[PDB]
Amino acid sequence: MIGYQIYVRSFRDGNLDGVGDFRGLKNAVSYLKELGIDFVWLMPVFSSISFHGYDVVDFYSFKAEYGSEREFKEMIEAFHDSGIKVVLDLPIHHTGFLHTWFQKALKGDPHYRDYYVWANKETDLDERREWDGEKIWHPLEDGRFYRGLFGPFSPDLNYDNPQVFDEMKRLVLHLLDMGVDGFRFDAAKHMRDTIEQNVRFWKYFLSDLKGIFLAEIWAEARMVDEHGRIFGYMLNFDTSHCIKEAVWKENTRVLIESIERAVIAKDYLPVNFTSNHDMSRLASFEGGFSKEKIKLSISILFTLPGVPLVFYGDELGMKGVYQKPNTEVVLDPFPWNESMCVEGQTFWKWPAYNGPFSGISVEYQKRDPDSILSHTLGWTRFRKENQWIDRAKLEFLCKEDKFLVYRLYDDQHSLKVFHNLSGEEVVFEGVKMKPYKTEVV
Amino acid sequence: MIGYQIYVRSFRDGNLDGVGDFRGLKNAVSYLKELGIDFVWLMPVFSSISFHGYDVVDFYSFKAEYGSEREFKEMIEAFHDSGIKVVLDLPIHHTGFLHTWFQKALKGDPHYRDYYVWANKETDLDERREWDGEKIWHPLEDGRFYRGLFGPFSPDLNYDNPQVFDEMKRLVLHLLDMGVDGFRFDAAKHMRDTIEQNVRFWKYFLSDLKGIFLAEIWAEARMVDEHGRIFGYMLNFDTSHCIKEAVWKENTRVLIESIERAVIAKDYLPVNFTSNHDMSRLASFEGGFSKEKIKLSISILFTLPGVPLVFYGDELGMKGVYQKPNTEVVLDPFPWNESMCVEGQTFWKWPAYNGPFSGISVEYQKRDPDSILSHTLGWTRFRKENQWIDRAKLEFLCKEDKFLVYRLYDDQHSLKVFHNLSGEEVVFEGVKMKPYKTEVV
Ligand SMILES: [Ca+2]
């Protein structure tokens, strides 16, 4: 299984407005199929007034700029025709400020009032998030306070209430019923107030369902495992980050620890990624880094157990240094040709880091065998031809500062992988480990 | 008659996706009527892949993100129901690279090759455009060169060809058939190679049609009046700049000579505007300026003969320093409320110069009789009650370096206007105008 995360507005336009949509996506299947993609993770495709859409105003309708429900269902059908699955990003931890549910709660509707979380006489009005450390309780003029982790505009949904659970499970069956193959549950860790209640919530929620369920759950261990049994796929921020740091620090230490910590003997498939929308792009890691280092990052990613995932554009080495609040700097328009002018090209804004004639268009890289695209296509074809690696066991054979060597195997296979994070050959078991290269035997 | 220019994507969202569309536009009729607007000028609503849409790929189809023809017509009808006219930006001067006609030309299609302008053995390949002073001739791999006033991707159509004339003459009818009240032709001065020919063109093209035809013809008040008798409206780029220049220096020299040059004694209506998509916002004029000066410019705009036009958001003091190639910097989302979170609100990217809670939203300024909006509303109410002014005569009653006094009048109406451009109080006939203030009598 190989995954590909897409920001729909910046990928492929299918109606000629320069704005990515459902029809364009439909037409990029040849490309996805060539890059060896099994499934696609689609960032929020529902009604939301933000360019990213993580604050949904109605899960029962899609972002008009992307197309109609009828156009959406036709796209699902075309992907399945070519053997690709569609996984939607489902932000049900909270809603948007403008969702009809929250609006009725504000106007006092008792039914909906309990759909959200309000401050009690014994509520710590000063409680803050982990990261941001910014507040989580928000005031209304009439003296009330509602809880909103991700901000005062993204009010928290109350899962202690059976009504809400029901409302949302009805939505998942509906989309499943529609052909959707699975979901990326955004903020899966904060569904309940305590972690023990959280594991049970997900147990009941996903209980009778089948599909690809992805989640971000940071408890670093033992809970990640508790959750992982239930989801089956867990976003690996640990190793995803570590692969890049080691390559950058040219030192196996972190990568080795991370593998033994987050990759080995799991009762679920960990999902390792080049990068995502909440951070800088693989090519812009630590002040960005060289073509040969980007490449090596991908080599390691595709020679490790679990499911490899590429953020759209990373296969081209697209640039992007994460920044707030204008987080669209990492969501630049995906370039099909150098002039960035061809049927299907998107240009909804001027690019932040990847402008035209930069030698990074798909068209352009397809031709230079030395390109990151040409390289990625190599490892992705390899991986496609070796599905067993997803759940293969890892055996270390060489843990040196400058280089690493391990063995993948299961009952009917075994492959030896060689990673050289430094610049100058070195021989292992008769094999020549070139500078900044990966070798399999 | 008051005009208003809108960048649809940034004005109002009527389908809850945060993108301006034809439906939102229909829902903004209450505001426009309340702001005193007569006709709206809509930036390009045709298919094109650019966020601005000046390089069209099909004039017979609308920008998908804006909506369907079903919804475009619903908007035309609604505006008309409130007595507001709809004028559409019509870039028929050229087409985009991706337009069907050009693709066929590129293939040497007999018929379509002559739809465009191809270089000669007797053509100056290094020829340049006045303004920025750049090449109008663009190369092709196979030795060919086509002419493109606005670049390699905005190929020039050839109006020497009767077919191109007919082709476009029909589009015009097609649009007028839909209830469209007029067009704004860009680069209207470059329709034919010689200005004696251009005039001939427009005379014939517009000859048998009726409607509001806006144009920019920089023959610097010379040939300018010949085209003015034909369109009936002339974008007075001249005085529009001099108002701002003057306010900025607090010296009435440029405004008086400008008024004498463009507004006085013309056989057509000069349209005086706050700004447009091609320059910095009024409020960001030359380092930009204070609430006081922004208010004066407006005051001066609404007290001159001709037709006053506001670029969407200028009635609020929206900031925007023009620059390339990301010309979207002056197209910031129109702020309906401080949080920029209210149904109808657009938020397709993070504001470049007008982020949330900056005290310039319609909602915030509406309850403040000292705001720019309240000021503008006052001038639109006045201008609404004094039609006669558009075609009125103005004679100077006083000219000083720091202030200015003139009289607007016609056979049955007379009004004295006193403007003060300096930071200190000034007097004229037992009447002192406080700094930056205006008073009519
Ligand atoms: Ca589109």
Ligand SMILES: [Ca+2]
């Ligand atoms: Ca919209």
